[PDB]
C-alpha cells in the first residue's frame, strides 16, 4: 500500500508518493527536487515527523508505520548566527 507524503521543505510544502519498500532517502531526494533544494548537501536536512522526531533516511518507509497520508518535515538544523 503506497503512502502519500507531504514534506514541508524549509517552509515550502510538496507532495511525494512513496512505496513502503523504498528507503526514506528516496522521499528525501524527491522532495528536495520538487522544491529545487539541491544546492546544500542533502545530509544538512533533518527529516522529522510532526512531533519533530528525527527519522533515519536509511530505514524503509514502511518500517515507520505511517498512515496512508502523512505530513513530514525537511528542516535545516537551527542556526547559530546572530551578531
Amino acid at each position: 500500500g503506497k503512502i502519500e507524503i507531504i514534506v514541508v521543505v524549509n517552509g515550502q510544502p510538496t507532495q511525494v508518493e512513496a512505496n513502503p519498500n523504498q528507503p526514506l532517502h528516496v522521499v528525501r531526494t524527491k522532495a528536495l527536487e520538487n522544491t529545487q533544494n539541491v544546492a546544500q548537501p542533502p545530509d544538512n536536512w533533518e527529516f522529522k515527523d510532526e512531533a519533530g522526531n528525527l527519522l533515519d533516511v536509511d530505514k524503509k518507509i514502511g518500517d515507520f508505520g505511517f498512515a496512508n497520508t502523512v505530513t513530514l518535515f525537511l528542516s535545516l538544523k537551527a542556526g547559530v548566527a546572530g551578531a
Binding site: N10, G11, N53, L54, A78, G79, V80, G82
Partner: protein
C-alpha cells in the same frame, strides 16, 4: 554612491547569489534607483511611520541611489525625515525626488504612484504583515510594530529578489502576503490577535546585541505600552562592517558600545534598561542571583547559546539567521518540550578509539589497521603515512619523520598537536533577515510576558530568499539520547527549586 560598508554587503550577497562577481554586483547596484512612495494614509499613523522607517533602514544599507517619493503634501514632512535617516546611514547615498528613473518601488498607504517599474505595496494591520504586488494594503492604527516592521522586511526582501533574479533559484516575487505575527499563520478574520499594548516584561535579559538584537530593539522602541525592566548584555562595540545589518547603527554609532547603543535606543520607552558592557558569564557572575525570568538569546555560536540554558532561566526565546533560513525557538526547561540545548546537541555517537583515530586521519576505511597499530603499538608503515598524507591534502615530507614511530606518536603530533592543520566560511546574513528575526524575537518576548498561548511548535522559521513558506511552524522534539541537560535530574531540581512545579 555605494556605502563605505558596501564590501560586507557584497560578502553577504556572495553567499546567496549564483555566479557572484564583485565588480558586476557593484555595477548592478549602481544601475538601480529603489523608490519608497507614501501618502497621507501612511504618514498619519504609527504603523505607517514604522514601516517607512524600517524600509529605509534596510534599503539604505545596500542601494546607492534611493527615490524618496511623497505622493501628496501631507507626506512632505515624513519625506525629509526619511532622507535624513538614509543619509545618517550612508552620507554619500543618492536621493531622488522623482520616480522617472526608478527601477523598483515600495509603496505604503492608499495611493498608487503611477510608476512603470515593479511596485510592491506594503502595509500592515496590528499583528498582520501585508504585501501585495497588485493593490495598496494600507497601514492600520495600532501601537504594535510587528506587522508593520515585518512588512518592511518582506518588501526589502522582494526588492532584492527582483533586482537579482537571474542569480537566484526559485526566488519568485511574492504576489500577496498577509501573515499574522501573533499566530504565524495566514491572518484570518475570526482570530484577530490582541491589540492591547500593555505588556509588562518583568525582568527580561536580552543577551548579545548585534544584528538580530537590533531588530528586536527596533520593535521594542516602537511599542509604547511596554513597561518593565530589561537587561541588555554585550561587551563589544559597533564596527563599520556591522552597519551592513545593524538597523540601528548609522555612521555616528561606529565605535560605540553595543550595550550603550541599546540603552540610548530605548531612552524614550517606559522600560528601565540596564546596560551591561560584559560577556554573559560576567553578567551572570556579578548578578549572583541565577533567577532569570525571561531571556532572549541573539548570540553567535552554539556554545554561547547552550551556556545560557545552563544558567536555567525560566524561559528562553532563541533567534538565528543562516543561509536559507531564519527563525526563533522557544524553551521552558521543565515543559516536556525541547530546551535550548536540544537545538544544538551534537549528532552521531561516541566512537571507539580505533574508529575515531581512523576518521581524524582521513582513513575511515583503515579502521582495522588502525586498531592493530594501537594494540601492537608498532611502527606505522610508509604506505600508511602516504595514505594519511594524501587523504588530508598535505605534503608527505613534513609527515615523513613519523614513519616507523608508533601510531599514537603520529596521531598525537599531527592531530592533537595541530601539525596537519598548519600544513593545510563566516555566514554574513542579509539586513532584512537580521531585522525580521529580531522583530520575531521581540514578539516572542512580549507575547510570552503578556501570557498569550504559545506556539504549538518549538520553532518558527522563515526563508526570505524565496516566496514565503505556507507552513512556517517547525517541530523539534526533546532530545532523547539522555545526554542533554533537560534529561538530568540535578538540572530539573535546580529549575523546580527556582520556579516551581
Amino acid at each position: 554612491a555605494l556605502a563605505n560598508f558596501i564590501d560586507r554587503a557584497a560578502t553577504a550577497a556572495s553567499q546567496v547569489l549564483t555566479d557572484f562577481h564583485l565588480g558586476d554586483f557593484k555595477a548592478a547596484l549602481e544601475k538601480q534607483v529603489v523608490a519608497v512612495a507614501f501618502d497621507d494614509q501612511a504618514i498619519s499613523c504609527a504603523e505607517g511611520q514604522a514601516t517607512l522607517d524600517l524600509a529605509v533602514r534596510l534599503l539604505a544599507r545596500l542601494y546607492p541611489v534611493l527615490a524618496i517619493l511623497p505622493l501628496d503634501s501631507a507626506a512632505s514632512s515624513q519625506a525629509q525625515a526619511l532622507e535624513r535617516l538614509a543619509k545618517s546611514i550612508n552620507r554619500k547615498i543618492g536621493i531622488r525626488r522623482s520616480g522617472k528613473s526608478a527601477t523598483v518601488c515600495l509603496v505604503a498607504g492608499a495611493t498608487r504612484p503611477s510608476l512603470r517599474c515593479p511596485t510592491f505595496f506594503i502595509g500592515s494591520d496590528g499583528w498582520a504583515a501585508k504585501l501585495s504586488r497588485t493593490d495598496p494594503v494600507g497601514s492600520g492604527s495600532s501601537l504594535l510594530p510587528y506587522g508593520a516592521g515585518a512588512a518592511s522586511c518582506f518588501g526589502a526582501a522582494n526588492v532584492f529578489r527582483t533586482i537579482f533574479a537571474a542569480q537566484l533559484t526559485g526566488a519568485e516575487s511574492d504576489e500577496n502576503i498577509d501573515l499574522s505575527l501573533y499566530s504565524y499563520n495566514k491572518s484570518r478574520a475570526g482570530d484577530a490577535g490582541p491589540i492591547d499594548p500593555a505588556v509588562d516584561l518583568g525582568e527580561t535579559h536580552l543577551v548579545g546585541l548585534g544584528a538580530i538584537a537590533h531588530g528586536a530593539l527596533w520593535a521594542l522602541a516602537r511599542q509604547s505600552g511596554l513597561s518593565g525592566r530589561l537587561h541588555v548584555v554585550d561587551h563589544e562595540a559597533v564596527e563599520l562592517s556591522n552597519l551592513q545589518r545593524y538597523v540601528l547603527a548609522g555612521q555616528a554609532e561606529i565605535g560605540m558600545s553595543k550595550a550603550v547603543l541599546a540603552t540610548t535606543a530605548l531612552r524614550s520607552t517606559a522600560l528601565e534598561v540596564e546596560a551591561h558592557p560584559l560577556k554573559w558569564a560576567e553578567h551572570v557572575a556579578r548578578r549572583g542571583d541565577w533567577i532569570f525570568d525571561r531571556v532572549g538569546v541573539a548570540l553567535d555560536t552554539a556554545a554561547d547559546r547552550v551556556a545560557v540554558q545552563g544558567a536555567l532561566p525560566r524561559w528562553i526565546a532563541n533567534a538565528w539567521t543562516q543561509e536559507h533560513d531564519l527563525g526563533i525557538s522557544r524553551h521552558g526547561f521543565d515543559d516536556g518540550q525541547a530546551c535550548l540545548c536540544c537545538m544544538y546537541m551534537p549528532s552521531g555517537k561516541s566512537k571507539d578509539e580505533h574508529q575515531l583515530v581512523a576518521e581524524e586521519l582521513g582513513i575511515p576505511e583503515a579502521h582495522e589497521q588502525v586498531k592493530a597499530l594501537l594494540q601492537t603499538n608498532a611502527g606505522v608503515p610508509n604506505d600508511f603515512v602516504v595514505r594519511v598524507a594524501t587523504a588530508m591534502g598535505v605534503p608527505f615530507e613534513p609527515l615523513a619523520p613519523f614513519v616507523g614511530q608508533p601510531l599514537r606518536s603520529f596521531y598525537q603530533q599531527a592531530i592533537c598537536g595541530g601539525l596537519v592543520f598548519q600544513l593545510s566560511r563566516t555566514v554574513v546574513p542579509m539586513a532584512f533577515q537580521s531585522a525580521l528575526a529580531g522583530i520575531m524575537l521581540a514578539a516572542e518576548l512580549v507575547k510570552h510576558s503578556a501570557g498569550f498561548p504559545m506556539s504549538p511548535t518549538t520553532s518558527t522559521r522563515v526563508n526570505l530568499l524565496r516566496p514565503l513558506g505556507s507552513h512556517l511552524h517547525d517541530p523539534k522534539a526533546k532530545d532523547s539520547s539522555g545526554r542533554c541537560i533537560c534529561s538530568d535530574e540535578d538540572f530539573i531540581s535546580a529549575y523546580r527549586r527556582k520556579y516551581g512545579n
